[PDB]
């Protein structure tokens, strides 16, 4: 029963991408959503069996996947509470994205290949989450990396999309290299790759740094966030999957599965990434970019909370699962707005008659991001902010990030709906089928269920804080939202420009790192092999 979900996704991938000539566009519009629905039924069974009823299961497919001398690893799947929760969230979001793609990608030539890549992408994410050993996780990590390369660069005749895919691939190579080094350290000194025997009470700092460096790649933290903003070249369904669940979450999942992180580093890196991402999102004028910077900020919050307390891992995973739903909703709604208006710029959006479902889903997702009380996003974010009070540095930065988050989120909501119409007087239209309505029904259902069921066991446990300190996140969010509605100026033009250039990390890489890389290549080749050592 547990294997079935992975089978359904890989089957949908093979069918759509190898037998699409027979199935057709309509055949992929059937087999994709059907397989994802079946996988949702299996994931729901897994979630009930493991999470609610505390029944972890291990399925060993085969032994001796790698058998060289002492080194021995097997392909085995352990469904633990973290795996069940992530499997459920991933499959729910993927099923929604598959339903969404039926209408969105009708205007794209390869809808069969797109559906195939989406299902293979979901399968590799489930392999990463459910792996019982570090090698299976690496298999999933690389599979999602390759699927992202094949999906971001889907538009090959655009130089920006191919460059965005190359950027993703290179950054992910650097990260998985650090991970491979850490896995080698852990195998050598613990004797196994299985997480049960992997447990080490005291680990040398080197392994901790290598683990963190590996994780900061997929979960785009500071210095490694360049690829996320660029990943906007790909079609909207890809962005929803990568940002909401498949890619950003993997780093957090790795850090939570093996608690080798160092408190000092994770807190500072997280709080910095939260603030920087919020500031970058303030300057952004593309709808899809703002939601990416919001993803960066939220990832910063999840990374930061690990430092605060022992329950930080539970709080981080709880935020991760709460975030995937609303963030997916934000991307799908942004895509539909872009499709309906033929515009990507916030300036040209405005009030216009539309579907009630889409406008409500956008409002509720934005409210969850903002932190509106009595919402799934609110509980998962307050759990972090309240517990971070002990670390004075992390708390102050995270509150400032909450303010900036509220400001941009409110500005975006005002610009997309409240603001008067800003596009031209030309005939534009995108009619929504019942499949899109089902997709939004699924996202809203996830959002509602999250409030009733919660995200962590310790979510509502009392944090012994004065009332003024416990309710401050709300006041900061409200103040930011009010300032964002008024569309006031917060920073001087020098800083607004700085934030628009994203801190100039990419300008540094191009002017110095890329030039050094190609000078090393020039010395290695032109000066030496084909110069000094080449005959006349």
């Amino acid at each position: 029963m547990f294997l079935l979900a992975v089978y359904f996704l890989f089957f949908s991938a093979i069918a759509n991408g190898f037998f699409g000539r027979y199935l057709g566009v309509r055949g992929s519009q059937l087999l994709g959503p059907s397989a994802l629905f079946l996988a949702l039924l299996c994931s729901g069974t897994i979630f009930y069996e493991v999470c609610i009823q505390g029944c972890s299961t291990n399925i060993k497919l085969f032994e001796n996947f790698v058998y060289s001398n002492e080194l021995n690893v097997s392909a085995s799947f352990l469904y633990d509470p973290l795996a069940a929760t992530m499997t459920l969230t991933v499959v729910w979001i993927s099923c929604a994205v598959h339903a969404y793609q039926n209408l969105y990608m009708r205007g794209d030539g390869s809808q069969t290949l797109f559906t195939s890549y989406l299902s293979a992408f979901t399968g590799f994410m489930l392999i990463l989450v459910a792996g019982q050993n570090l090698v299976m996780l690496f298999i999933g990590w690389e599979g999602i990396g390759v699927c992202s390369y094949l999906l971001i660069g889907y538009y090959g005749s655009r130089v920006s999309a191919v460059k965005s895919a190359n950027k993703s691939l290179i950054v992910n190579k650097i990260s998985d290299g650090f991970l491979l080094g850490s896995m080698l350290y852990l195998w050598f000194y613990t004797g196994s790759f299985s997480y049960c025997s992997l447990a080490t009470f005291q680990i040398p700092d080197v392994v901790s740094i290598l683990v963190l460096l590996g994780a900061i790649g997929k979960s785009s933290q500071l210095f490694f966030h360049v690829w996320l903003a660029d990943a906007m070249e790909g079609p909207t369904p890809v962005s929803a999957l990568i940002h909401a669940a498949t890619l950003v979450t993997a780093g957090i999942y790795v850090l939570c599965k093996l608690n080798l992180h160092s408190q000092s580093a994770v807190g500072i890196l997280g709080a910095a990434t939260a603030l920087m991402g919020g500031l970058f999102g303030l300057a952004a004028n593309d709808l899809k970019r703002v939601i990416a910077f919001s993803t960066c900020s939220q990832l910063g919050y999840m990374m930061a909370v690990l430092s605060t307390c022992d329950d930080g891992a539970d709080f981080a995973m709880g935020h991760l699962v709460s975030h995937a739903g609303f963030k997916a909703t934000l991307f799908l709604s942004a895509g539909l707005s872009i499709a309906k208006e033929n515009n990507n710029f916030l300036n040209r959006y405005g009030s216009r008659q539309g579907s009630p479902t889409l406008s409500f889903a956008t409002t509720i997702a934005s409210l969850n991001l903002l932190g509106f009380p009595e919402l799934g996003g609110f509980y998962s974010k307050e759990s972090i902010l309240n517990n971070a009070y002990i670390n004075q540095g992390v708390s102050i930065i995270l509150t400032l990030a909450t303010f900036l988050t509220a400001f941009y989120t409110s500005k975006v909501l005002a610009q997309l709906y409240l603001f008067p119409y800003g596009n031209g007087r030309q005939q534009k239209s995108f009619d929504i089928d019942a499949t899109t309505l089902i997709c939004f029904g699924l996202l809203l259902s996830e959002m509602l269920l999250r409030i009733f069921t919660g995200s962590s066991l310790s979510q509502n446990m009392t944090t012994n804080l004065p009332a003024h300190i416990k309710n401050l996140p709300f006041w900061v969010a409200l103040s930011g939202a009010l300032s964002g509605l008024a569309t006031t100026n917060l920073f001087s033009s020098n800083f607004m420009r700085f934030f628009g250039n994203r801190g100039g990390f990419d300008v540094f890489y191009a002017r110095k790192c890329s030039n050094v890389f190609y000078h090393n290549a020039y010395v290695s080749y032109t000066l030496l092999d084909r110069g000094f050592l080449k005959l006349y």
Partner: protein
């Protein structure tokens, strides 16, 4: 736009070969290659 006859479950509008596999042209009378 929409579906060809307004129904999703209708026969495909394309009759013929989507492409030539390996670049080979089908024999007119159905003679095997």
């Amino acid at each position: 736009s929409g579906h060809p006859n307004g129904s999703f479950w209708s026969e495909g509008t394309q009759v013929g070969l989507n492409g030539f596999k390996y670049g080979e042209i089908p024999l007119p009378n159905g003679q095997p290659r």
